[PDB]
Amino acid sequence: KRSGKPSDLPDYKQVYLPYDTAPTKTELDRERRKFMHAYSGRMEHRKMVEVKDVPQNMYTYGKEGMSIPISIFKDQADPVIGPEWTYPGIFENKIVAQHWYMEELFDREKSNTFESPWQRQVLDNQVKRRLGKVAWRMSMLNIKTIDIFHKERGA
Amino acid sequence: AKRPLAVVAPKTSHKHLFLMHMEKVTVTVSPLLFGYGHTLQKAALDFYRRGLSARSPFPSDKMFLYYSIDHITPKIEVTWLDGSVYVPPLIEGVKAQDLIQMVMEQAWLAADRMSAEGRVLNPIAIDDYKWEQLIAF
Amino acid sequence: PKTVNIEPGSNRFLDPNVEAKAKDIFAVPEFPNKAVLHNWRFFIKAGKAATGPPVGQEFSKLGLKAMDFAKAFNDRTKPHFKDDIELIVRIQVYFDKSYIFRIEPPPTAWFLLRAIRKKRGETGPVVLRGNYCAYLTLEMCYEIAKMKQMSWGKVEYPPIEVRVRRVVGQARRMGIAIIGIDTVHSSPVKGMTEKQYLEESEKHRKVHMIQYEALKAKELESAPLIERLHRPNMAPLTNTQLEEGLKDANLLNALWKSSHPKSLFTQDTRDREMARRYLNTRGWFKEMTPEEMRVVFLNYRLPKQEDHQRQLNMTNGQAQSQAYWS
Amino acid sequence: VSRLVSPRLRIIHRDYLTRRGGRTHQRCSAVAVDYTPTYFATYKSDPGQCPRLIDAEAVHGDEQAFWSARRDFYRGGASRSYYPAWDRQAQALIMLTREVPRIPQEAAFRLFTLGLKMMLLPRLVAGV
Amino acid sequence: TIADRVRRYTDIPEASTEEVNQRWKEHVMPRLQTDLEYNLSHWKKQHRTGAGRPAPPTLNEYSLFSVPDHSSLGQDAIDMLRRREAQREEDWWRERKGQLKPP
Numbered sequence A: 001k002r003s004g005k006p007s008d009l010p011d012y013k014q015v016y017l018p019y020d021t022a023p024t025k026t027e028l029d030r031e032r033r034k035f036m037h038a039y040s041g042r043m044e045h046r047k048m049v050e051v052k053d054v055p056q057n058m059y060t061y062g063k064e065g066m067s068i069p070i071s072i073f074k075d076q077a078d079p080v081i082g083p084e085w086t087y088p089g090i091f092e093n094k095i096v097a098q099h100w101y102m103e104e105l106f107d108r109e110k111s112n113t114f115e116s117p118w119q120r121q122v123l124d125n126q127v128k129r130r131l132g133k134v135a136w137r138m139s140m141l142n143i144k145t146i147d148i149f150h151k152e153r154g155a
Numbered sequence B: 001a002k003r004p005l006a007v008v009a010p011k012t013s014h015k016h017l018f019l020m021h022m023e024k025v026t027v028t029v030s031p032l033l034f035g036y037g038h039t040l041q042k043a044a045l046d047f048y049r050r051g052l053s054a055r056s057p058f059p060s061d062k063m064f065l066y067y068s069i070d071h072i073t074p075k076i077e078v079t080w081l082d083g084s085v086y087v088p089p090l091i092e093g094v095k096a097q098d099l100i101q102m103v104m105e106q107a108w109l110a111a112d113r114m115s116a117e118g119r120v121l122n123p124i125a126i127d128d129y130k131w132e133q134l135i136a137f
Numbered sequence C: 001p002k003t004v005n006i007e008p009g010s011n012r013f014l015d016p017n018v019e020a021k022a023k024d025i026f027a028v029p030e031f032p033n034k035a036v037l038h039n040w041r042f043f044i045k046a047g048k049a050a051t052g053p054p055v056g057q058e059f060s061k062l063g064l065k066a067m068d069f070a071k072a073f074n075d076r077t078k079p080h081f082k083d084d085i086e087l088i089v090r091i092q093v094y095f096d097k098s099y100i101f102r103i104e105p106p107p108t109a110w111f112l113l114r115a116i117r118k119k120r121g122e123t124g125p126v127v128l129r130g131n132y133c134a135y136l137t138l139e140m141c142y143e144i145a146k147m148k149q150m151s152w153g154k155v156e157y158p159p160i161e162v163r164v165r166r167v168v169g170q171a172r173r174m175g176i177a178i179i180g181i182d183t184v185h186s187s188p189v190k191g192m193t194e195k196q197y198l199e200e201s202e203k204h205r206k207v208h209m210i211q212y213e214a215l216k217a218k219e220l221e222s223a224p225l226i227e228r229l230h231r232p233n234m235a236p237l238t239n240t241q242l243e244e245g246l247k248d249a250n251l252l253n254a255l256w257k258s259s260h261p262k263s264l265f266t267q268d269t270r271d272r273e274m275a276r277r278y279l280n281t282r283g284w285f286k287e288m289t290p291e292e293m294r295v296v297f298l299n300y301r302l303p304k305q306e307d308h309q310r311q312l313n314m315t316n317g318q319a320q321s322q323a324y325w326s
Numbered sequence D: 001v002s003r004l005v006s007p008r009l010r011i012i013h014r015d016y017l018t019r020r021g022g023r024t025h026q027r028c029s030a031v032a033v034d035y036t037p038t039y040f041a042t043y044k045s046d047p048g049q050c051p052r053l054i055d056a057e058a059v060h061g062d063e064q065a066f067w068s069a070r071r072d073f074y075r076g077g078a079s080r081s082y083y084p085a086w087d088r089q090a091q092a093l094i095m096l097t098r099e100v101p102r103i104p105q106e107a108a109f110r111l112f113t114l115g116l117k118m119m120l121l122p123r124l125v126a127g128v
Numbered sequence E: 001t002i003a004d005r006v007r008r009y010t011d012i013p014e015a016s017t018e019e020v021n022q023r024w025k026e027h028v029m030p031r032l033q034t035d036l037e038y039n040l041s042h043w044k045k046q047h048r049t050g051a052g053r054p055a056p057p058t059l060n061e062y063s064l065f066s067v068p069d070h071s072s073l074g075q076d077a078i079d080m081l082r083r084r085e086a087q088r089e090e091d092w093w094r095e096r097k098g099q100l101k102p103p
Helices: A025-035 A090-096 A102-109 A119-141 B040-052 B096-117 C016-020 C056-060 C069-077 C108-116 C138-144 C160-172 C194-198 C201-220 C241-247 C250-258 C269-281 C290-294 C304-309 D037-043 D085-096 D104-114 D116-126 E007-028 E036-049 E059-065 E070-085 E087-097
Strands: B022-029 B063-068 B075-080 C036-039 C042-044 C087-094 C099-104 D009-012 D015-018 D026-029 D032-035 D053-055
Touching: A090 A119, A090 C138, A090 C160, A090 C201, A102 A119, A102 E087, A119 E070, B022 B040, B022 B096, B040 B063, B040 B075, B040 B096, B040 D085, B075 B096, C069 C087, C069 C099, C108 C138, C108 C160, C138 C160, C194 C201, C201 C304, C241 C250, C241 E070, C250 C269, C250 E007, C250 E070, D032 D037, D053 E036, D085 E059, D104 D116, E007 E059, E070 E087
Parallel strands: B022 B063
Antiparallel strands: B022 B075, B063 D053, C036 C087, C042 C087, C087 C099, D009 D032, D015 D026
């Protein structure tokens, strides 16, 4: 949809650097050279793919002291980013937040070997959805008969 | 009464406890009485929720809860414009849609008796009995 | 150079300045217990609300001169706002035609395209588009998540670390590969070795837990009294007990009494053992003395701090002490 | 012997012939103990001037928010069912049976009744 | 057989509400102020001040009415029974896909 999209896109205004030792040019494109790829899909169906619009320097990118242009209010500029351990659960989310195939999660539960104590919570919220996709799948059939893939598909 | 009362009464199911002609619907219970599971304590208190529901067009400020003490079985008392109070008998096994049906069904009889004594009656907004409606498709 | 605040995760909510006027406009004019007729939703700019088809029409379907609301809107939204901040209005029309509307921060999809500088059509899920779009890092989502609170009366809860997984997932669903995950290496730093980077996370990532739990437990102690009640876990019951325990409820009763953390009212040997004599006839749990049940038949949803506070025999000494006073 | 010796409580019985089973005409009984019509005058006043009956607004404000309340938290979600009536009384029965503060002001006369025997015994003794 | 198949519906709520009557008449009844008619009249006064004292109950005061609750018990037994049926898909499609592997 067109509405609900930003028209003016402010640019990353670096507030203060996160380091005293300049990351010399030589290594910049030596580590960014590693980021132009990012995995996708988490199982045997692991798919290392490409990322368009790669930023140029990631020592400075987001780790600290850069601004993000979600400028909303009148007196609130592009907020600065505090260091990592200043945000709650970040290196804990790194374990939890990701595309989780249930194939990859139920072997972790039936072996009770969770990398994280919240993957027990990203599991329920994932099954509690798929049950809802059924309790809605059926509270509709109490109206009519809805038949999957019975209408034409494609062009 | 200025004339013999009605004979035939409309017979339809009432979803919501709209103020047909009542003036105050009080619901007395005694929380000293207790019970797990479907009892009369539960059947009358959901009738409070089902009346206070954001769905029923009942004026929420006209329903009065009343915690009693002396082991008063849950009473539901409705008062009509003429002031004649009416307690729907809480037969065991009853629940919300019965009481919302009892008081609303009796609401047409009682509003009829008020219209017999000579009380002028008002226009009612809701028409629980579909009369100006036809099923369309 | 200058780290603004060195604390293990104290940047959770906004600045009290911006959080002062955060809820001055994002407030819910309380539900009048009326019967809603229409729950409309719009995108509207900072204060550029018109009487046109976007707003004035749906009122005019109902005969309301929405030339007024737009002003009552701009009576609250014209100041306070950076230019061109498309807000969401939750107009709610009651059976008396009297509306009540909550203004809300921009949709996080609007936030996400800003924080990455991409216009409409540039972003997409990889399975439709084939490429991860603009990068991000978890450090950024934590600030999109600070202007996105479900309850703008209670900005605190759900917590941040639990609603950032929300904005992260919405991002990934748009192609926004953030760096901390999705990639072989996290954000490279000129500070220290990857090990001297990982050894500084293994402490931080766990210091947060005693921070995150306490905030999860302090919220528990304020939850409705029914939310702290006992709900035994069902992971132990195997799916034939779990089914043979649904035909006759007696088993799911005697279970509850059998595995119930010790309280002043459940220190009845005969009561707790009356159950224990019911299960044995049913061939249910027989080799698990009461203790190893409570540690497995506990409400798993308890924060680990209170997960213990109820654990026998931690609640055995002071058990008979706490009672309904009078 | 009054059944419920509380004389204000009056037992009323009502047996009805209601349509059960769709066609039948069964016998349903609505038994109840309710207050004697004596105790109806001071109650059809809205302040509940009749004691033994408390306007629910007293024990807490806005039952419009206390009974209409629904389960809310991470344990509630959007399947936020109403509260079960069995505790929704308890959180109101426990509020009824709280400590009301017996003040020492009443205790003085009761204390003036505590030293009743010990000192009235020598009164008639020393008054001959 | 009549009084049996209805006992599916009431004895358990009775086996409960006959245990509370025990708990009530044992622990709270002794320390219960019997002058309620004065106590209630005190809150009808505290409400006519508006700044009265409606107090919220606490867990220890409330755990008297702690009971086996088939509202939750019967529910999460199904869900846990179900997230085993949801568990036997990824473990099924892993088994079927494991039948294409040679011996």
